[PDB]
Design a protein around this ligand. Structure first.
Ligand SMILES: *C(=N)[C@H](C[C@@H]1CCNC1=O)NC(=O)[C@@H]1[C@@H]2[C@H](CN1C(=O)[C@@H](NC(=O)C(F)(F)F)C(C)(C)C)C2(C)C
Ligand SMILES: *C(=N)[C@H](C[C@@H]1CCNC1=O)NC(=O)[C@@H]1[C@@H]2[C@H](CN1C(=O)[C@@H](NC(=O)C(F)(F)F)C(C)(C)C)C2(C)C
Lengths: 306, 306
């Protein structure tokens, strides 16, 4: 029993983190085989961040302008190139700790673990979701750029996020590992704002199932609603609309608790209209939307990795 | 910016987890140098759990009754002994991944990371606090026994917790690594209950400072109270009393925000008497007590590890 915001074990990623210095700017890089990936703005100074021309900045650099350290060992850079918003640094030594990996682009509502790093050294691990407005609510200080987000599928690490910047509302924006931004952001110091965020409905439902599995039942009722009646209520409260695909995804949780998806929507419908009235669910007084259906199954059934 | 429930990177611990089988019972063990530590009830069957006599059960075993696997490699057990509630299995191979480590007993209110494991394989990592009633609010399924809790101090892993059991309220109890239980619990299937829990006041204050650092200021006020006036209010709400040592510990956070500890107590005093009234603090509608002052400093200043 119990329910916690659980991250993936980070061992396989810790062995890939390196420190990248170019000029007076130091940040983190990801070392897989003989390539080090890092944010391209490592080649920027202060004069450059308002309106950088990265093609110009890069041609004016040579391999020896880039200092790559894996702990104390220095890595010799033998070639560099730019792919969208990431720099790919070819080095003379392949990382012997390279795990089986792939590069995936995730969708809003999906979750991943973040290994926050400073100077190539891992500082902490935490779980978060990609918000519907393509930002993440992370915890990041100066120097954290190049920290990566990831999932683990059996033995395979899927990298899905590299950190680039903090927006003025205190939320965080970055790229996939091919260097393409999530959301309409750019890596310069211009005036950028996230769009309005919405609550991830399928995730709230998954969390209500986790609560039932763990013995919190007080919000249930006998009513049933329809997909269209629910979605009409959800839009009023800035909740994402629910689709038949979401219903099917919630199947395993419905079967395990004997509570039909559309039954649970009627409970959620009541919670949105009447509030929780000083009661808590799994130790929270707000509705939690950063657990996917698969997170709940994994934590309430006990899937491991190798 | 931002604030997350952050765990320590788990790499150094992942390399020490093994699977221990005795009979039809399999659980996790901790492999440091040539010793494997695991819960002693691995030597129990179903008939034994109501009233086990562990001295009798252990003398009736030999080294070959214990199957230890580190992934696929089998470890040969060359000797065994009991230390309080843990079994120490001497093996013929010293773990080459043994980190610099020590065994520490933590106090109520302190936090640590948990590497949850099944069959020797790491499943997830999460942060929790040792509650004033010596339980932890973990997330654990069947087979998770022998999972460990730990902190990292620079390069040194301090192991502080090994998991043994779930209580009927759904909370979790275990031992330090010398096998001594936290709290008045025993490793048998008798009727045991945790005592009443209290809120960890020094931790709530640290979290309020984190909120100020991150721009949440709405709960502040101009009032100041005394230690005795505050503690008189805290006891009414089942909060731990505040000591001068706690005040001193909150020093760095007071200096960074320019808000005196006793000023912040007056805000907390108001929040306890009037509630939060539909407002949130760092994304929570309840007062959070599982961040120590040191957790806040670490996350809002950016201490790494090597
Ligand atoms: C990478 N090392 C940092 C990470 C930041 C620092 C505070 N927390 C974080 O997540 N990234 C940057 O310094 C990037 C960098 C220039 C500007 N920048 C920012 O994060 C700034 N934000 C923006 O300009 C905005 F609002 F547009 F996103 C800052 C004002 C420092 C928060 C570049 C090249 C994008
Ligand atoms: C170790 N593999 C498990 C971990 C448990 C299973 C569910 N979640 C957990 O944390 N530990 C046990 O099976 C221990 C084991 C006998 C009884 N036991 C329990 O956890 C049981 N609880 C108690 O007997 C109680 F209430 F006294 F704590 C159970 C009913 C299965 C929850 C021994 C030797 C203590």
């Amino acid at each position: 029993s119990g329910f916690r915001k659980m991250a993936f074990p980070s061992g396989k990623v810790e062995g890939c983190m390196v420190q990248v210095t170019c000029g007076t700017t130091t940040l983190n890089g990801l070392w897989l085989d003989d390539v080090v990936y890092c944010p391209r703005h490592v080649i920027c100074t202060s004069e450059d961040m308002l309106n950088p021309n990265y093609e110009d900045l890069l041609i004016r650099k040579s391999n020896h302008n880039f200092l790559v350290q894996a702990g104390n060992v220095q890595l010799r850079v033998i070639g560099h190139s730019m792919q969208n918003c990431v720099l790919k640094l070819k080095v003379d030594t392949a990382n012997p700790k390279t795990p089986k990996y792939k590069f995936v682009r995730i969708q809003p509502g999906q979750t991943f673990s973040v290994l926050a790093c400073y100077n190539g050294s891992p500082s902490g691990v935490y779980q978060c979701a990609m918000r519907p407005n393509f930002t993440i609510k992370g915890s990041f200080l100066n120097g954290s750029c190049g920290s990566v987000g990831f999932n683990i599928d059996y033995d395979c690490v899927s990298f899905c996020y590299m950190h680039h910047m903090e927006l003025p509302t205190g939320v965080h924006a970055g790229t996939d590992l091919e260097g393409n931004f999530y959301g309409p952001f750019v890596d310069r110091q211009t005036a950028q704002a996230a769009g309005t965020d919405t609550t991830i409905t399928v995730n709230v439902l998954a969390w209500l199932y986790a609560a039932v599995i763990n013995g919190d039942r007080w919000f249930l009722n006998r009513f049933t609603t329809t997909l269209n009646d629910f979605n009409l209520v959800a839009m009023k409260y800035n909740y994402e609309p629910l689709t038949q695909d979401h219903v099917d995804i919630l199947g395993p949780l419905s079967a395990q608790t004997g509570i039909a998806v559309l039954d649970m929507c009627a409970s959620l419908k009541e919670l949105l209209q009447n509030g929780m009235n000083g009661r808590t669910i799994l130790g929270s007084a707000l509705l939690e939307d950063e657990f996917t259906p698969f997170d709940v199954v994994r934590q309430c059934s006990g899937v491991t990795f190798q």
